[PDB]
Ligand binder design. Structure first.
Ligand code: UVQ
Ligand code: UVQ
Ligand code: CL
Ligand code: CL
Ligand code: CL
Ligand code: CL
Ligand code: MG
Ligand code: MG
Lengths: 227, 9, 227, 9
């Protein structure tokens, strides 16, 4: 995308989202990041929406194939699950490469740095969902380390109702439950996050209240599933 | 268990 | 896909459908057709499902972009609509190329030949939906000619409840209404098809009855929209 | 107006 203007790539990413063309959206946003400038709040959301949708579809297909393969246990189901897995890993590696070159290192404000470190934890978590080899423990620890750094900044720099802080805690709680085999840590994190946000809702405008309560409901939905 | 969605919807 | 066994391509197309990976499904089926052997009934349905889904998503995105472009009337919306349009045209050309090399010419039985000529009419109809240049009349006539040959065979060789004959009539009626500016011809074809099928339902088993009545309901749904 | 679907569903 090197020959297209940054502003045109952003415009086309927004069009691609409207047209439900998320692979295109992710390619446009990759091109925008590679221009080398920092991203605004709105642009960070376009980057996350694009890749979350692409990898979400891959994850769903991998789970369908993995279930068939496990019920089966010719080479075709395994081969095709491996093909989908390799493509998923390649998209995660691409996102992680954008974060490492050079989004995280140039992010100084708490909102941008927490956003990118949450993404880093998420894409290592997606790698961990399909990992089995000699690096699986290391992939899990890479997710944990990214989420932990994001948590440390968020607790120092953001109020307990901040939607980025809340979504980070939600996703790190999912990591604890589904990846790290730490359901008690998952439940504790979700409950403490929910309660501390509840106690800060009185400070918020109607529109901020709506955002914080939406994510608090996601925390509650998980606690209901886990308890 | 659900993680955060890309958009509010 | 030249190095993969025909049977493995068919197996993986079925897996791809289960995983909702329709681009993969279409690539596997293209590889199967290119083995050079005729397709069975089940295999023809896999080929059609794969490409109908791929081009259906492209059509939906083209319509979103075309609507935005028309409301707007920089170059970005037009450029991106053109990109999607070119990709849609390329998939239609690929399907038409498979039908011409050599599915239609090797199809002798009425069920296979009607199936492929219906597909040929459909993919020229999708080209006609986006056409504007010096060949637009010729694209419309190519769709018409394919559908007409399929209709002539179907009326000679198949009963009026045959599901292929019914789906052909449904799609040719959509061609008349939406492409050829012939709403009266569309309504006449849908009504005569419906009534002739109704009068033959008494000959059918429970499972064939279910298939024929399902498509008759689609004919009725269009007649209700058009009248 | 609807054309034929790929599968019965
Ligand atoms: C991880 C994370 C990213 C963005 C937000 S948000 O900008 O506050 N926002 C945007 C889309 C996702 C979302 C979902 C909600 F329920 C509330 C707000 C948002 C928060 C977290
Ligand atoms: C064009 C066409 C293709 C296939 C059929 S069918 O084999 O009878 N079948 C398969 C999937 C689509 C469909 C939809 C129905 F409502 C009933 C049967 C089928 C028919 C037409
Ligand atoms: Cl494969
Ligand atoms: Cl900075
Ligand atoms: Cl473009
Ligand atoms: Cl033959
Ligand atoms: Mg420039
Ligand atoms: Mg062979």
């Amino acid at each position: 995308m090197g020959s297209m203007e940054r502003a045109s790539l952003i415009q086309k990413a927004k069009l691609a989202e409207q047209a439900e063309r998320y692979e295109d959206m992710a390619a446009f946003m990759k091109g925008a990041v590679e221009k080398g400038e920092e991203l605004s709040c709105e642009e960070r959301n376009l980057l996350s929406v694009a890749y979350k949708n692409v990898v979400g579809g891959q994850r769903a297909a991998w789970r369908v194939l993995s279930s068939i393969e496990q019920k089966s246990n010719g080479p075709e189901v395994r081969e095709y699950r491996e093909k989908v897995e390799t493509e998923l890993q390649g998209v995660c590696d691409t996102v992680l490469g954008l974060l490492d070159s050079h989004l995280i290192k140039e992010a100084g404000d708490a909102e941008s740095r927490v956003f990118y470190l949450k993404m880093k934890g998420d894409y290592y978590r997606y790698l961990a969902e399909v990992a089995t080899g000699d690096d699986k423990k290391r992939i899990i620890d890479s997710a944990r380390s990214a989420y932990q750094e994001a948590m440390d900044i968020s607790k120092k720099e953001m109020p307990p109702t901040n939607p980025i802080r809340l979504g980070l805690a939600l996703n790190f709680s999912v990591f604890h439950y589904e990846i790290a085999n730490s359901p008690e840590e998952a439940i504790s994190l979700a409950k403490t996050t929910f309660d501390e946000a509840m106690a800060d809702l009185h400070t918020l405008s109607e529109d901020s209240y709506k955002d914080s309560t939406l994510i608090m409901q996601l925390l509650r939905d998980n606690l209901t599933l886990w308890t | 268990a659900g993680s955060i969605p890309g958009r509010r919807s």
